[PDB]
Amino acid sequence: CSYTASRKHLYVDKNTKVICQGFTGKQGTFHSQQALEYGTNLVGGTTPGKGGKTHLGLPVFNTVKEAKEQTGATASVIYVPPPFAAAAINEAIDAEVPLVVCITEGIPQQDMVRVKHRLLRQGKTRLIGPNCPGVINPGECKIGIMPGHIHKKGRIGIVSRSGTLTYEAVHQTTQVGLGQSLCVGIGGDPFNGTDFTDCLEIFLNDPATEGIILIGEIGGNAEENAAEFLKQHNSGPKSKPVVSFIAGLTAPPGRRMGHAGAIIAGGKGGAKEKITALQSAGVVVSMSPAQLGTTIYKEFEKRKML
């Protein structure tokens, strides 16, 4: 019933069964092949008007509902073009798909505001995205566009507003041998279905996640809300090491820095205010994006957790 109830569907695993919306288009095809070689249980997909076809050896359906009924999918990944993406997300919500990962970049803000309105009043479907790279549980389930090979099953939970910057954090934690428990890219859009607190909650309660890396950037106040959640839930007696990097220290105000939501507007959204807020919540902020792995490593060492 409450949307926070769906937080748990964020944790994909080897048992997660996935369908692809926009399955027959060029993007959907390419990433579905990569999902298949990674070992993700991709079980079919949809494209309105093309059901009754097979694609990549899997069945294509006209609707998400039929696809879910026929395959038992618990997740859906969306690669539909902007003009139809909101209708795709809504169709998944109507079908009560537990987890929807919308990859698509370029969805109108007004369309997402309408989608989020529906989203917040239901509790069955959890949406990650739009404009995000997806979610990956190393060695068990890959939903999205990240390169599978840099990941290594391990101990660090990673949540990020960006795409390729997340790969830096993954690569650095794989190199120092810590690995990752779960990596979630929440996307660079201003209106989306999952924020950092949603992920933090899953991470704090996950025995497999011993440390967290939170990657943020300028714009909005999701990082500041994450710091409050941490002051309340990770300030003792429970306490997992949290390391962060916030992008955009040098960004000029007033410009959209690639990501639709990366903008310092009205003097609100700057990087140092987020860094200050996170530090005060116990977070170790790494000033350099190249030192995320070594920083969280040192935190593990100090707590004698290695």
Partner: protein, 395 residues
Amino acid sequence: MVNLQEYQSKKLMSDNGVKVQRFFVADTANEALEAAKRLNAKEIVLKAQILAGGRGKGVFSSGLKGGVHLTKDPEVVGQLAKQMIGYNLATKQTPKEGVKVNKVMVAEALDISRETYLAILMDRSCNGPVLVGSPQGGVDIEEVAASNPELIFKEQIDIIEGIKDSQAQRMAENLGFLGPLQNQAADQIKKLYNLFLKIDATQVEVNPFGETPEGQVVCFDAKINFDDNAEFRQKDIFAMDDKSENEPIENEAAKYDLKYIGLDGNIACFVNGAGLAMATCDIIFLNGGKPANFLDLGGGVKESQVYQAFKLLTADPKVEAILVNIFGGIVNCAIIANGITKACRELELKVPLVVRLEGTNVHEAQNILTNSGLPITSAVDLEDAAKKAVASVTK
């Protein structure tokens, strides 16, 4: 960022029922004259249409001072317009030689007995549209929020139900409109909200939103920011985007759908991914260099985009080194390495190149760059890359 001339955003408002000064735009002195007569107004305002601010105290190359003039005489509108059109208007915020003026707006000059601030914006923090208003208008809203927070009012608008009469009335009353003017303002607020939705704006700011002595509620000046993602359904509006006052490279970069943002440095850089691009600009600054620009090729990177990026960085003469950091993206490194050396050769670039490639087939990619003969340094990681790029340019 869509940029509309004053006359364009006012036309957009008036075509949509929002009350704005009556006005016409002219291409010729003669047209300006005839338009001033049509207006049939007691007092006429003649305004040069350029995007830059400071028109009021600007100077034209004709010798005429002031890009904004008032008069009660149509013929004077024509005479002054003749000394405006075709000439360059220089202001406190235009390049040194000013901007050519192709059009002028001729509008009825209205008095402002009261000014308030009114805005409608997509507020991330409220999950939707919000009506922001303040009776203290004419002033930049930021300052008002600083000194008098108690004077700024906000109404959360439910996107599904739309704006409620109650909400528009309460906002109008909060902005101090009274009696009949209160209903007139409330009604302009609803019209503005519908306009905001219709054109996929992320913000419509009316300042001053006010009343004339004659008891009229008018949107005197407005600024509209559009959602770039909505372009496919707002083609007529994006078509009127004025890119003639933009940084040339920024225009060029747009031709290819490249997000380029000029900065002040001498170390150019291009990266796949906005987060990574901001972090690269950040780490170059942290290691003591000044980035020359922000440039996002996007996460999935194609060889032709690497090529266009080099072609772009070719126009900026400040660039003394280029840092390429590509990580991820569905194309393998060897293809990227190839387009790099090919771009280098064909565009005849001689500036040092610091390259950080990570992904599939990097060994081969490394080989391609080392065997190229070109001044290319292959970095260990981002920190290494920034340090090497900073070491390659002047003090």
